[model samples]
Target chain A: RTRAEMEETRATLLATARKVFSERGYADTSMDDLTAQASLTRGALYHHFGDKKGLLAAVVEQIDAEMDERLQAISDTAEDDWEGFRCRCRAYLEMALEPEIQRIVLRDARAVLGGASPDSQRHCVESMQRLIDNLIRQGVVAEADPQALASLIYGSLAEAAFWIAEGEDGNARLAQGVAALELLLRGLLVKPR
Target chain B: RTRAEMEETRATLLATARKVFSERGYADTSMDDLTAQASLTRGALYHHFGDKKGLLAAVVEQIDAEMDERLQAISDTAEDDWEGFRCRCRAYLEMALEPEIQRIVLRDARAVLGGASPDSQRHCVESMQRLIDNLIRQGVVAEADPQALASLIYGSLAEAAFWIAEGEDGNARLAQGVAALELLLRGLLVKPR
Candidate 1:
């Protein structure tokens, strides 16, 4: 296939793989099913991703990138750094609430791929740190290691998402999660004089 | 086998399995290896746990119970509610720092068993909630849903453990994790009178 055609085929396969893996999880979904769903051949998939696990890694990579983009936008649209950061925090939880993220990234990706790939980790942690750094600059938050605080916050968001996804009533859990996050996030803001 | 004999056999198997799984890993360890290490047979293992995954679930349950006791003891010894909660948070990180819980409960068990076992989840969550409830009563913490906050804290601890274990420099990561926990946790406190 030509360069453009090859890229198109690869993208199509990845999109199809992401949906299937999210629905059925990493172990249950097979190369045959993925290939069939993508309306592509095993040869194309093998050429792009090497195997099922590789495809999953690609899918996770794509999702993480998209999540970071969305989070950045959410924070950007807010009125102030503190509110922006909190909005981003809320946005992060909302993304995790999505079934695709819960299954593909939170549960299966971590399971199959072992942990967050460093690329995703850097993006996830750095995004949080950037907002935190902003808070510090504006004197709207207390002093602490931005990276350390970011990881902790990232860990909280990631874990809460998993908890929500694994539960029977996700919406109820989501409400609880929002309240919990607000309580925790509010701690970072400087008290009014 | 006599009922008394079965109990001893089961306890022995659990110890051996915990050792092997921690040193190796859940996916790498085999049922054959586990039975052999325990000086038992496949028939005995299957009779006890039904399968390898079941045995893993039991191991996690036991570890989580032990962890809860240790965490409770840490908090219980503290003089005040705020100090007790902080102590419990630190203890949770320290327990996760252990190789057995790191592998058996954090990474492998989650992979094999898929999410926290409801029994283990409830015990861990309830233990944290109990502390949060106490803080609420004492007015050390602000009003919010205790279970929701517990889950957020639980999620943070669980993720930090995974991040620490999966990192190239666990000790460094552990230090960072501790600092992060303290900062995020400080958020739940009501300003002292």
Candidate 2:
């Protein structure tokens, strides 16, 4: 196949895989169904993802990398801790309510990756700490353990996102979630010397 | 079979079902596996929980009812808000951390009932509210907004409990979870008049 055609085919397979896997989850999606969805031969799938679990790992990696890229914009603007913190917090709420994010990250991520997988939980926690650390840098947040804050804050987001991903009024919950978190964070805000 | 023997058989089936279902979760466990585990004929199996789903539901009901009973005892105690709140929070953490509770509540409960089940969420919310209201009445908590406080406090507990239920070191996390929550309550404590 031509390079352009192969890239197109790969993208097509990827898009189809994301939909099938997110809807059916890892254990349920058979290779036959997956190839059928992609309109690719089984061999073609093997060329790209090697196997079903490998393909799932690829999709999750793609999703996480994209999320980190999105979050990087927030990190880049961390010249001021509080403003950057709020921005990152707001950006996360925005993404948490996105439908695709709900499907991929909230539902499929944990089910497929086992929420505590070193790659999954640690990476997510690290991403969240990027924002929390920024908040700490500013004399705004009342000091405590950032790790605990990450767990509590990200956890609330995960639950809220799970609801939203399942077609509940996720955005509404995300908004309410933001308010609750900000209030909790008020305790973390600091007084400048 | 005699009536007493039939009753004994049914109880045996349920006990075995609980063990198999808890170990494998609801979706993964099969009728053949169920029969094998209980060492019963298909006829005896159908006579009890009716269907696999029905059997799982009965299991959830039994375990969750026990949980409700245990939690109610904590709330039914003294009017001391901090102590009562801490105790109630501990109940949530400990339950979430226990392997059996994790299998039933965190693992199978959502897999079987779905995340949006008002049966569990609403019931828990109402229970937390009564406790929070008592805390406010006794000047143990800020009187600002009882319902919001109820959700926020409960949200943290539920999230933390989920962590313990779903993770490898869930027991360790639960211990830290109790201390973390108590600390939060202490800081959020309303100033005495």
Candidate 3:
């Protein structure tokens, strides 16, 4: 096969795998099913991804990159840096409600990938750190290591997202989590809201 | 064997396993090492705890309970309820600095047990929820779902603990986490500190 054909085959496999993984979860997904869905042979799939775990990693990376881009766009288009930051945070919690994110990224990925899961990257942490550093320099947020505070914030948001995703009354829980998150964010300001 | 003898054997196994697991981690410590240290047979260990995973679960429970008790004592003996809460939060961050907790509970257990790990209980969340509820009723904390806020707080602290445990300069990281935690906690208050 030509290099172009190989690249197309790899794309097809990833797209097929993402859908199957999200719908059936990582544990329930099978290599045969993946190959059939993509209309490719086992050789092609294995050649590209090595195994199921590798495919999952690629899918997770794709999803995480999308999430990162979406959040960055939210921050970029806001009225101000602080508002942008808050909006991005709120958007992150809401993203957990999506079935694809809920199943693949948050749930199965954690169990299957263990410590090396997408959480190790937690793209939001780096973005939030950058925003916080800017805020601190602007005398908005209090003086502290931006990375430390960003990690704490990301942790809280991720946990709250899980709480919302798993709760019976997700809509109600989402509201409470947002309220709670807002309250916590207020404390980071030099001048309390 | 007599009931008394069985109980002693179980206790010996638990104590021995705890020490070994903390020192060598869950993956490195073998069934033989555990049995030899306790002077018990593999059959006895299996009969009591099922497997190494089961033993790790039991150890996690014991450690979690102790941490709960320690935090409760701190809260119970504080100058005031709010001060107690702060101290307990600070203490939780410091606990991650301990070798046993860092290795067994935070690092190894998480990788081994996945989502069913000790964090599912997160003993501190329950206690913190109760405190937040009381504070809200007393008109100190802002009115919100105590459980939601507590989960968020626990998540932040747990993540910060991991950061400190894995960092190059733990002492500095711990201080930053504690400071960051205090800032977040302030936002939960009706009257910001």
Task: Write the residue-wise lDDT of candidate 1 on A50-122 in tens digits.
Answer: 8888888888788888888888898888887687787888777776668788778766775667546545665
Write down the TM-score of every candidate. Answer: 0.75, 0.63, 0.87
Identify the superior model by TM-score, candidate 2 or candidate 3: 3
Error (Å) of candidate 3 at residue B33 is 3.7
Scoring each candidate complex against the real one, what DockQ results? 0.37, 0.14, 0.60
For residues B78-111, write the lDDT of model 2, one tens digit per residue: 4765766678778878887566778776766655
lDDT ranking from best to worst? 3, 1, 2
Cα error of candidate 2 at position A106, Å: 6.3
DockQ of 3: 0.60
Per TM-score, what order, best first? 3, 1, 2
Worst 10 residues of 3 chain A by lDDT: A114-123
Interface RMSD of the predictions, in order shown?
3.2, 4.7, 1.8
Model 3, B55-103: lDDT tens digits are: 8888878788888889889978887888888899899899988988877
Model 1 residue runs over 4 Å out of place are A1-7, A17-57, A76-79, A97-99, A102-123, A166-169, A190-193, B2-4, B17-58, B96-123, B164-176
Candidate 2 segments whose C-alpha is farther than 4 A from its true place: A1-8, A15-65, A96-99, A102-122, A129-149, A162-175, A188-193, B1-12, B19-39, B46-58, B97-99, B102-123, B129-152, B165-171, B183-193
- Specify the poorest-scoring 10-residue window by lDDT in model 1 chain B: B110-119
lDDT values, one for every candidate? 0.76, 0.64, 0.79
Over the stretch A118-173, how does candidate 3's per-residue lDDT look in tens digits? 25544567788888898899898998888889889987887777777777787888
